[PDB]
Amino acid sequence: LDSPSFTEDITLSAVMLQEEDPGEAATMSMYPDFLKSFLEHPSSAVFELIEQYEAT
Amino acid sequence: SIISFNEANELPREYLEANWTLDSVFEELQATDKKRVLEENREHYHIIQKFVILADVDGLMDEFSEWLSNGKNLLLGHLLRFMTHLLLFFRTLGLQAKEEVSVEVLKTYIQRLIN
Amino acid sequence: MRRSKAEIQRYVENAQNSASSPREKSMKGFLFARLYYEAKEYELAKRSVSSYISVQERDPKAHRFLGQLFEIEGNVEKAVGCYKRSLELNPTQKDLTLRIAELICTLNIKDGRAEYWVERASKLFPGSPEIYRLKEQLLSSQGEAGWNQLFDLIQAELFARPNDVYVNLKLVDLFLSNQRLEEAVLHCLKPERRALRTDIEWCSCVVRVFKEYLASKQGQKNTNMRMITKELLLAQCDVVFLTLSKKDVQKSKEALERFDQALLSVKQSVSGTDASDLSVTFYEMRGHYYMHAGTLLLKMAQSCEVQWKALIEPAALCYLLAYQVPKPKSKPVKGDDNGQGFLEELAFDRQSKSGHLLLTLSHGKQNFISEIIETFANQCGQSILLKFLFEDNLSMQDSFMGSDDISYVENRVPDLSELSQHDNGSLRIHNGDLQHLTWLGLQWHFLSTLPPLRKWLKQIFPRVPQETSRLESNIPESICLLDLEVFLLAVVQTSYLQLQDNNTTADPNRPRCLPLPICKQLFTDRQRSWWDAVYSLITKKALPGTSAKLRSVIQHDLTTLRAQEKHGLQPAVLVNWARGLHKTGYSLNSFYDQKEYMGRCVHYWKKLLPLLDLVKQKKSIPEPVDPLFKHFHNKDIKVSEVKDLEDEACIAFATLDLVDGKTEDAIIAFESVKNVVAYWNLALIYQRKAEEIENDCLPAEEQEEFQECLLKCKGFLKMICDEYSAYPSIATSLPVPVETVFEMLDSVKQSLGEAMDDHSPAFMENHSVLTTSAIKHSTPSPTKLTISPSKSARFSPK
Numbered sequence A: 001l002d003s004p005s006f007t008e009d010i011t012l013s014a015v016m017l018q019e020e021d022p023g024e025a026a027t028m029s030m031y032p033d034f035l036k037s038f039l040e041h042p043s044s045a046v047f048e049l050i051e052q053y054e055a056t
Numbered sequence B: 001s002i003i004s005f006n007e008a009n010e011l012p013r014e015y016l017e018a019n020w021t022l023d024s025v026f027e028e029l030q031a032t033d034k035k036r037v038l039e040e041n042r043e044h045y046h047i048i049q050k051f052v053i054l055a056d057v058d059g060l061m062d063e064f065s066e067w068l069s070n071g072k073n074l075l076l077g078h079l080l081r082f083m084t085h086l087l088l089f090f091r092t093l094g095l096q097a098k099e100e101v102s103v104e105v106l107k108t109y110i111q112r113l114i115n
Numbered sequence C: 001m002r003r004s005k006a007e008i009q010r011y012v013e014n015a016q017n018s019a020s021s022p023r024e025k026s027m028k029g030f031l032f033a034r035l036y037y038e039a040k041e042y043e044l045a046k047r048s049v050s051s052y053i054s055v056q057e058r059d060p061k062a063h064r065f066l067g068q069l070f071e072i073e074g075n076v077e078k079a080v081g082c083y084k085r086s087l088e089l090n091p092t093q094k095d096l097t098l099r100i101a102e103l104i105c106t107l108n109i110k111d112g113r114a115e116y117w118v119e120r121a122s123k124l125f126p127g128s129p130e131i132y133r134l135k136e137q138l139l140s141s142q143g144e145a146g147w148n149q150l151f152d153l154i155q156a157e158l159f160a161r162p163n164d165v166y167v168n169l170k171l172v173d174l175f176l177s178n179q180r181l182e183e184a185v186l187h188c189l190k191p192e193r194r195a196l197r198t199d200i201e202w203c204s205c206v207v208r209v210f211k212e213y214l215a216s217k218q219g220q221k222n223t224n225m226r227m228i229t230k231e232l233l234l235a236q237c238d239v240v241f242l243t244l245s246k247k248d249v250q251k252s253k254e255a256l257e258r259f260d261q262a263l264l265s266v267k268q269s270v271s272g273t274d275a276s277d278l279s280v281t282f283y284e285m286r287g288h289y290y291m292h293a294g295t296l297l298l299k300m301a302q303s304c305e306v307q308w309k310a311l312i313e314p315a316a317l318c319y320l321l322a323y324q325v326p327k328p329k330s331k332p333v334k335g336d337d338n339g340q341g342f343l344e345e346l347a348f349d350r351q352s353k354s355g356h357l358l359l360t361l362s363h364g365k366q367n368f369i370s371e372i373i374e375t376f377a378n379q380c381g382q383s384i385l386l387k388f389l390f391e392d393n394l395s396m397q398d399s400f401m402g403s404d405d406i407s408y409v410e411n412r413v414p415d416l417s418e419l420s421q422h423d424n425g426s427l428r429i430h431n432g433d434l435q436h437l438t439w440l441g442l443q444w445h446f447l448s449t450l451p452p453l454r455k456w457l458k459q460i461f462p463r464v465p466q467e468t469s470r471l472e473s474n475i476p477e478s479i480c481l482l483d484l485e486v487f488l489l490a491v492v493q494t495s496y497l498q499l500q501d502n503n504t505t506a507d508p509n510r511p512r513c514l515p516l517p518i519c520k521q522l523f524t525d526r527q528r529s530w531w532d533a534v535y536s537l538i539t540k541k542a543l544p545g546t547s548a549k550l551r552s553v554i555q556h557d558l559t560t561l562r563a564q565e566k567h568g569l570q571p572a573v574l575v576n577w578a579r580g581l582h583k584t585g586y587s588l589n590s591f592y593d594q595k596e597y598m599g600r601c602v603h604y605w606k607k608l609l610p611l612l613d614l615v616k617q618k619k620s621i622p623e624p625v626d627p628l629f630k631h632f633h634n635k636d637i638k639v640s641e642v643k644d645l646e647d648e649a650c651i652a653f654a655t656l657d658l659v660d661g662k663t664e665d666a667i668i669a670f671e672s673v674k675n676v677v678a679y680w681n682l683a684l685i686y687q688r689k690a691e692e693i694e695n696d697c698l699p700a701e702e703q704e705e706f707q708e709c710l711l712k713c714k715g716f717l718k719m720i721c722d723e724y725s726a727y728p729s730i731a732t733s734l735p736v737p738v739e740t741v742f743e744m745l746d747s748v749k750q751s752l753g754e755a756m757d758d759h760s761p762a763f764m765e766n767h768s769v770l771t772t773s774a775i776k777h778s779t780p781s782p783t784k785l786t787i788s789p790s791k792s793a794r795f796s797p798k
Helices: A007-016 A022-040 A046-055 B022-030 B035-040 B044-054 B057-069 B077-092 B099-114 C005-017 C022-027 C029-038 C042-053 C060-072 C076-089 C094-107 C112-124 C129-140 C143-160 C165-177 C181-188 C191-198 C200-216 C223-246 C249-267 C277-302 C308-323 C340-362 C368-376 C379-390 C416-430 C434-446 C453-460 C481-503 C525-538 C547-561 C571-586 C591-616 C642-659 C663-673 C676-693 C700-726 C728-732 C738-752
Strands: none
Touching: A007 A022, A022 A046, A022 B077, A046 B077, B022 B044, B044 B057, B044 B077, B057 B099, B077 B099, C005 C029, C022 C029, C022 C042, C029 C042, C029 C060, C042 C060, C060 C076, C076 C094, C094 C112, C094 C129, C112 C129, C129 C143, C129 C165, C143 C165, C165 C181, C165 C191, C165 C200, C181 C200, C191 C200, C191 C223, C200 C223, C223 C249, C223 C277, C249 C277, C249 C379, C277 C308, C277 C340, C277 C379, C308 C340, C308 C368, C308 C379, C340 C368, C340 C416, C340 C434, C368 C379, C416 C434, C416 C453, C434 C453, C434 C481, C434 C525, C453 C481, C481 C525, C481 C547, C481 C571, C481 C591, C525 C547, C571 C591, C571 C642, C591 C642, C642 C663, C642 C676, C663 C676, C676 C700, C676 C738, C700 C728, C700 C738
16 A cells, blocks of 8 residues: 555666666566566457557 | 639649659658668668558568578667567468568577577 | 439539539539439440540549440440559559450450550559469460460469469360370379369369370370379269269269269279279279269259159168278378378268268168168169169169179168267368268267267367367457357257258158258358358468458357357357257366366356346347347247256256365255256265265264265155156156166165164254355456465365
8 A cells, every 4th residue: 555656766767777788678678578468468459469568 | 522623723733643652752761862861761660660651561571581681699689579579469460471581580589588 | 213314414404504614514524424324324424524524634533434434335445545544643543454454355465565464463463363364365375485484374373372273274274285194194193182172173174184194095004004093083083072062963963974984994903802002992982982872862852853762762772882881901101191091081981971871861760771781782773773873874784883792781780989980080081161060960969969079179170278268358369179169069059950940841751961962051151251260260271361351250259159248149059058068078087178168068057047037027039130140939948948947057057066176065056956957966976975985994973974975865866766756757857867876776775784774864854044145156266376285186086
């Protein structure tokens, strides 16, 4: 119970500021999220899958 | 559709008799004098967007084959991810992609994941 | 309502009188032209569209429509002119480029415009069959230079489409026109051409080429001649099979006669001691000859040329002769499996078909095969068979059938276990054809035995999972073997009901199911379209670009098979699925397979219960306008049968809880139904509980529990015997023969010993306490794996 929207974002932005390349690490972090989104969506829901890739 | 147009208000004939194709737009974009547009037209995502608009999957697979041949180590990780998931998307829709190129994209992406 | 010429003319006159300017009159001319065309007044349509074109010269639709009017008049050159003008104004009209090419080739093939329009069309529609035909027409006019280009075109089209019958025939005709008979033969012998054996024109062409080759080489003892004679007998057999299916009786007689003469010509070259590949093929083709002869006799009875009664015994002899031909003894020669496995597959197909037809033709008469052998397995019977098939066209000496020895026939009734093995062999040649599967399923259904659909489906679909955890999904990639099994069970049942409703006026000697070549389509075109889509998607045989359309067909009708919302199934189909799955699942020794079949059986019972409530309320069941399975009102569930089906659903729920290892919940559920089938399951549970307690050194507490389990078992077995003694009809509802119930009752009496026969404690007086809480048979919703390790599953399948 109760309220995520401001403290987690500050911690993640502060962790990526310690990486030698925050752009490459942002790209790398999305690899499991893309596969997970593919596995969660049945082959009938292909457009909900693309909307989830856009959101990611 | 409207039988009663008064001829007294001519828009230019070039605009009214324009034979539009999807290809003719991208040919005109290649013929532009604007240096910035000619540079952006060579970016990998704008090439993908062009072929997606044209509905030409086979031409997109030829570009992917060329990019893999010009040096597997020069492809950015996000682009190989995108190419892989686009091929999985085409396969889910039952669209015919070049299997040889699809296998080579997958192998190159798997080798990146290993590294 | 077609508008009259006078109505259209009054409308045109009124629409012209209301127009303020000559230009405004002409602007309505395209609408008037369409109205005159719908009235077939083509001259008035032309005047009306020409008056429109003179004001709107840049409208492609008007020029296209004017071209269509000139085409209907046979003015091809003016039509082509109007179509060119339409295509110039709007180049997106790809179809018009093809139509211009067709019209120019029809007018004058020697027109240099034809090559330009055909090549322009070829760029727009790569690999169109119509463009191939137009290119063939052009090149056929060009002599020797046309020949090389036509050869290259045919090779390119065969590379794109290897299974096109027409292109393959044209390549053979092009070899024959150049006297290249050896290359025509080599092309016919290609293993990729086996897919074309379903086409009558191809098989007839192969037969022609091989006969011409064998005639040209008469006198040369070549190994190639024996191979071509082998493939000629196979191609003749295919022509007979295809003519039996696609042509009339007379063409089938002529096809069988040509096959008879072909066998006779080879008989002198086949000494009975030669284990040659030609000898093996000759004896295999002898079996097919008799199978096809028996099928032709049943075809003559079906066309009303002869009565069924006169042709049943002669046809049964022909199927007996076909069934008894020995299978080719496979020596597994390491290295070239493609040739000898095919004759073994044919032998399995012949033996399956002939054996099921012998059982169908006997009508269950025990001595039927013996009576046929005595009557017809002699030279007089052969002479009668020859007269039925060929009338006076062939003598006993000029016929293979007349010269063959049929006197050595065994009195062998087809065994059901052997037939089940032969059926599994026959599935390889038919590659999962729905007509073949439905026909076999009907044969087993007429024998009152469940078809072994699970074995067949595992052979056709070796990569498909048995069950899915996502029954609510309609995604085509989620198909399981159980979805295919219920589909086949419903197809077989609906085909059976359709055969019964058509047979209420049929001759008593008519076979219940006809042979496959002469049997009408057993399924609907929708059932075909669904099965062929599933088969093509799973086997990856789908044409490029069709896969989206195939997925949509599958997705729609998969909702029906899974009994999802608004499924439109008749209740009788759900009952048949639940029963079929219950029987199959109960017969399996695998815990996981039993659980999957029982889980799916219980799913259909849960979908049926709300429909039984509607029947109890005397409400009509919704019927779809185009149903995947036809509704048969002769099988509508009666209000009297609803209770017995509710009790059967409760038994299936209790059996699933038993298979899940919830033995106590299953006992309570079976005790609630108070039926012989529930008492039998209770007796089996208490017997197994007693056998689990039976270890050679029991504590006194475990000895009391053992005796209580045996007393409960004796109690339920006695209730079954007492009910059977009151109503002997119960033997049909029992899962086992009544003899097995008596044998188990007598074993339980022996284990209890004689010392307890006089103390019955009142078996039912002490469980009158626990009120009504609706036992929610919950399937577990998917809650994340929390591993708590402390109950080893107590249920080993002994």
